[PDB]
Ligand binder design. Structure first.
Ligand SMILES: OC[C@H]1O[C@H](O[C@H]2[C@H](O)[C@@H](O)[C@@H](O[C@H]3[C@H](O)[C@@H](O)[C@@H](O)O[C@@H]3CO)O[C@@H]2CO)[C@H](O)[C@@H](O)[C@@H]1O
Ligand SMILES: [Zn+2]
Ligand SMILES: [Zn+2]
Length: 500
């Protein structure tokens, strides 16, 4: 990392241009150049890159990612004077505390709200249950009731949580990573309601961020679910919009997961002092936050003095009312696994690839561990057995595949299980995304597991199948490295799984 300057990473939906202006003031005052960048998948890139001591000096993201960053020792400890701490709301500091240490600066507080087109819908619906009938009305005029991003569990979670869904139960002073509320009766109800909106053609499974945004900002749909960052583009459109409380579901409020946008400092940064000066005395000020806010709205902010200005805005009170009805996201390392698990269940259920029950049962298993994967894919009959994950009976092809792939029967509470292809593939996909491997040679693998390559059990990172002697030799012969993932596990690619 270059010494004498600041590189800052922040997400593309945020006011990076405004932040750049703060960055130019810092430069005019100190002579230090600040470069603001908005890399795709920055939150996944940061941990790969920072582990080798590269990356940005400062990284911005909601607080939920930061526990994982801190655990891996990627973040500098933040030590602001008590005077400074007093400038921000206490709960925001709590969001960036990990094992008794402050690991980032809180910037702003974020919650989803219902955004609606006053001209098309002067009085927005109070319940999710009214949408179906309302959509029918609007379709008559070539419009739709509701579009929003269904690709990200962040947007669908408020509904899933409404009737009892939850991530980790908080108890005995800590989130209990073994008590996950992802396949309880309330989650199923909420996901079932969502899936029925899709079967009945009130929404498309394919809708993503860009598609819902365009549709709303061009007057084609009456409602959308988004955060404060989205308001700036609606302003610039012809749309006359309101911001209000999310609908209820079975008479219970929708429960958004509340994020605190936070700025962490790379442990490997040689510019820690400069980073702290920038953040404390330039960004976390009335003028600094306003510069960023004018670009893309921040939502409620952590800085008391400026939040007082922002609080007069009805869109902000609506933001805070939805926030009070939701929960502050946990920052524990297990959150990544939770988010991936739910993302997959929603995508699967919405396309009909799996039932709601199957999809949530798998999500439940994935959110609470990966011990099951290791048991199934141990180093190295299935017919009539169910899938460990989704609890559905293995078809006879999936039973065959379990055998040919050289899987191991998993016993849970006395019962024997295999895995269907869908759950197995989703699980391995999450492994690659959650544990970026480092490349290793055959020699490195042999040395690590005191065993010749022909005798090492190396599995395909896509299908879980045990690589043949020739498949392993392919890696060596053609200079294609193996992958060292978690627990010193070594993965490779079978002939069939050699993507372009
Ligand atoms: O879906 C897989 C996804 O899971 C995790 O992403 C979550 C974020 O960690 C979490 O903060 C939240 O992201 C939202 C931001 O808070 C908000 O400011 C704005 O940017 O919208 C974001 C949602 O798109 O929720 C997501 C889950 O949807 C994980 O960190 C990701 O790496 C992973 O891709
Ligand atoms: Zn399954
Ligand atoms: Zn394979």
């Amino acid at each position: 990392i270059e010494e004498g300057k600041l590189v800052i990473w922040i997400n593309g939906d945020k006011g990076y241009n405004g932040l750049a202006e703060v960055g130019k003031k810092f430069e005019k005052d100190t002579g230090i150049k600040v470069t603001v960048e908005h890399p795709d998948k920055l939150e996944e890139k940061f941990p790969q890159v920072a582990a080798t001591g590269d990356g940005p000096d400062i990284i911005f993201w909601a607080h939920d990612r930061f526990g994982g960053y801190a655990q891996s020792g990627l973040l500098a400890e933040i030590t602001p004077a008590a005077a400074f701490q007093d400038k921000l709301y206490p709960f925001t500091w709590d969001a960036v505390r990990y094992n008794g240490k402050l690991i980032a600066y809180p910037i702003a507080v974020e919650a989803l709200s219902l955004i609606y087109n006053k001209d098309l819908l002067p009085n927005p619906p109070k319940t999710w249950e009214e949408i179906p009938a309302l959509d029918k009305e609007l379709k008559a005029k070539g419009k739709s009731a509701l579009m929003f991003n269904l690709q990200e569990p962040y947007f669908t979670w408020p509904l899933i949580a409404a009737d009892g869904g939850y991530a980790f139960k908080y108890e005995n002073g800590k989130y209990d990573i073994k008590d996950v509320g992802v396949d309880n009766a309330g989650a199923k109800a909420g996901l079932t309601f969502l899936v029925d909106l899709i079967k009945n053609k009130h929404m498309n499974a394919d809708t993503d961020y860009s598609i819902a945004e365009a549709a709303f900002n061009k007057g084609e749909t009456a409602m959308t679910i988004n955060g404060p960052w989205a308001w700036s583009n609606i302003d610039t459109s012809a749309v006359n919009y309101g911001v209000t409380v999310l609908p209820t579901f079975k008479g219970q409020p929708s429960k958004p997961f509340v994020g605190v946008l936070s700025a962490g400092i790379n442990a490997a940064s040689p510019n820690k002092e400069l980073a702290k000066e920038f953040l404390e005395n330039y960004l976390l000020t009335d003028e600094g936050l306003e510069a960023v806010n004018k670009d893309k709205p921040l939502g409620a902010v952590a800085l008391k003095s400026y939040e007082e200005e922002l609080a007069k805005d009805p869109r902000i009170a609506a933001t805070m009312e939805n926030a009070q009805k939701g929960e502050i996201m946990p920052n524990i390392p297990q959150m990544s696994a939770f988010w991936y698990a739910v993302r997959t269940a929603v995508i699967n259920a919405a396309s009909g690839r799996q039932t709601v029950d199957a999809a949530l049962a798998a999500a439940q298993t994935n959110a609470a561990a990966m011990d099951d994967l290791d048991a199934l894919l141990a180093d190295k009959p299935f017919s009539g057995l169910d899938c460990l994950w989704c609890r559905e009976p293995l078809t006879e092809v999936d039973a065959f595949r379990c055998m040919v792939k050289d899987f191991h029967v998993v016993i849970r509470e006395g019962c024997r299980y295999g895995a269907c292809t869908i759950c197995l593939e989703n699980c391995l996909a999450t492994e690659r995304r959650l544990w970026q491997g480092v490349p290793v040679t055959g020699e490195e693998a042999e040395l690590l597991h005191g065993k010749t390559l022909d005798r090492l059990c190396i599995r395909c990172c896509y299908c879980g199948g045990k690589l043949t002697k020739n498949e392993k030799h392919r890696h060596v012969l053609f200079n294609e490295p193996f992958c060292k993932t978690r627990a010193n596990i070594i993965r490779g690619r079978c002939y069939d799984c050699c993507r372009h």
